[PDB]
């Protein structure tokens, strides 16, 4: 039918909301006291124990909420076992680098149900956030431009609603892996899309298809920037879920079935690491992760790479188009960051078969040995490779060259490297030269020329 609620207004049942093929079943949104959006507030001044605020002055007024610093709300969606704390941890890192009103949005009550109910109840958490956002603005004159909504799985689409209702005056929505079922290819109204804020940037990570493959994340581009880490579908570190042409989404969602949620949880783990690593995730404009891995988009263009996650607001062309894809590789854990380097090597010495490896040394550290080529090491031939250094070395000072093969080498041959050029991802080229050659498994230091 239609249904109206105190404060939030009325929630229709029409197509697109319901009826259309992706979301056929007519369900309407549980009511606001049933959804039960709580806003738990964390700030620099109360970092680790929240204080519950709400859209009225007798709540905001004594609290650490401050109108002279930004507010960014973290809306959950799928919460894995153990993962309850994740919304807080995003706050804890914001505090390591900024003064912020970090409001985590809770709506466990609306989310613990069938998926389709929750897809629907997303609408209430959407108007809830828009209500608080419009509130600070009338109550206190606080522009929406200071507001940032971060939402994961369904939450993404909650933030998408919130922004929609604030009529895209919200500074930024960040979708961290917008759930797919009931939203992909569904119209903009029903889902997160570039118009829900002044800037929307999304991190796809589990973009496989949900059926047959349990690809919980959307794959469709929905932001002005869509970063696809590790090619937006399998993440290093993450076990893959086994196939099924009949997937129980409600079962996945309540937790009756099994689910390697890893690929979907990774977008907020990347976002969290991003806060404290501000060059560590640079997204290269490729046109696919395959072109990208085939070393063809490198370095960043003229006016940067965008940082995936937290720092993407700083990329100067972020709203020049919608749906701009960017690729990058991350770690498989811990500090997720990575810095990519292209190094070319020109061979000097004998023709041999072997592996050439290079290793960089710079003002702030040194990489390990990354293989550049395998097979016939022909003198005066060049070879190139792009690799993901788990270490930013700083500006390079020297490089080292080394080769080997698994055959006893009778001649005791000697290969070395005439010049070795390192191109940073920003694109600075550093040159290194040597007249020496060296024996198998000896480290030939090159130095600037």
């Amino acid at each position: 039918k239609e249904v109206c609620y105190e404060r939030l207004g009325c929630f229709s049942d029409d197509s697109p909301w319901s009826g259309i093929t992706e979301r056929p079943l007519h369900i309407l949104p549980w009511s606001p006291k049933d959804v039960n959006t709580r806003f738990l507030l964390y700030t620099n001044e109360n970092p680790n124990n929240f204080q519950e605020v709400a859209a009225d002055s007798s709540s905001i007024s004594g609290s650490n909420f401050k109108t002279n610093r930004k507010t960014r709300f973290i809306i959950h969606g799928f919460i894995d076992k153990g993962e309850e704390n994740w919304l807080a941890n995003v706050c804890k890192n914001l505090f390591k680098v900024e003064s912020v009103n970090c409001i985590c949005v809770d709506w466990k009550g609306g989310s613990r149900t069938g998926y389709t109910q929750a897809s629907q109840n997303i609408r209430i958490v959407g108007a809830e956030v828009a209500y608080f956002v419009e509130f600070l603005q009338s109550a206190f004159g606080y522009s929406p431009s200071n507001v940032h909504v971060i939402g994961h799985s369904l939450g993404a689409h909650a933030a998408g609603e919130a922004g929609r209702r604030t009529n895209g005056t919200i500074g930024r929505i960040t979708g961290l892996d917008p759930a797919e079922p009931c939203f992909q290819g569904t119209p903009e109204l029903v889902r997160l899309d570039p118009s829900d804020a002044k800037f929307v940037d999304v991190i796809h990570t589990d973009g496989a298809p949900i059926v047959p493959n349990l690809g919980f994340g959307m794959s469709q581009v929905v932001g002005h920037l869509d970063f696809f880490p590790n090619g937006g579908v399998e993440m290093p570190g993450c076990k893959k879920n086994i196939l099924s042409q009949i997937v129980d989404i409600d079962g996945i969602w309540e937790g009756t079935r099994d689910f390697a949620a890893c690929n979907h949880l990774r977008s907020y783990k990347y976002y969290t690491d991003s806060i404290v690593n501000p060059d560590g995730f640079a997204g290269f404009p490729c046109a696919s992760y395959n072109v990208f891995t085939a070393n063809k988009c490198f370095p960043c263009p003229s006016g940067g790479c965008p940082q995936m996650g937290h720092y993407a607001d700083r990329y100067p062309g972020k709203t020049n188009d919608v749906g701009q894809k960017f690729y990058l590789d991350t770690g498989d854990a811990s500090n997720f960051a990575r810095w990519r380097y292209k190094v070319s090597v020109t061979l000097s010495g004998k023709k041999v078969t072997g592996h050439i490896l290079v290793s960089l040394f710079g003002n702030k550290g040194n990489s390990k040995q990354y293989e550049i080529f395998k097979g016939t090491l022909k003198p005066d031939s060049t070879h190139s490779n792009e690799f993901d250094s788990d270490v930013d070395v700083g500006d390079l000072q020297m490089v080292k060259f080394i080769w080997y093969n698994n055959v006893i080498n009778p001649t005791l041959p000697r290969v070395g490297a005439s010049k070795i050029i390192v191109e940073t991802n920003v694109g600075k080229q550093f040159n290194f030269c040597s007249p020496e050659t060296v024996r198998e498994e000896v480290l030939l230091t090159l130095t600037p020329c």
């Binding site: 490896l357 290793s359 040194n366 990489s367 390990k368 040995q369 080292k400 080394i402 080997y404 498994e441 000896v442 480290l443 230091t445």
Partner: protein
């Protein structure tokens, strides 16, 4: 049979098993798995006999100069830092 080629992180039982023969486990009680070899200037373990290290041996052509000390030391813990030569 013999097991060969296990990747970074796979559980292992001696270093031969690992593509970068270093089957590591910090702590005596831990479940030993293939680790990467040490970079230049990080900590290392000297080359052992027991095929499972606490700290990996160094990557190619670095020496891990620490203290290959007496028995005791060498019957378990000799560490060092990979240095070039």
């Amino acid at each position: 049979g013999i097991i060969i080629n296990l990747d970074e992180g796979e559980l292992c039982l001696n270093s031969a098993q690992c593509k970068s023969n270093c089957c590591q486990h910090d702590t005596i009680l831990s479940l030993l798995r293939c680790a990467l070899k040490a970079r230049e200037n990080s900590e290392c373990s000297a080359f052992t006999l027991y095929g499972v290290y606490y700290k990996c041996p160094c990557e190619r052509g670095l020496t891990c100069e620490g203290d290959k000390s007496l028995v005791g030391s060498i019957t378990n813990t000799n560490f060092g830092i990979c240095h070039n030569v």
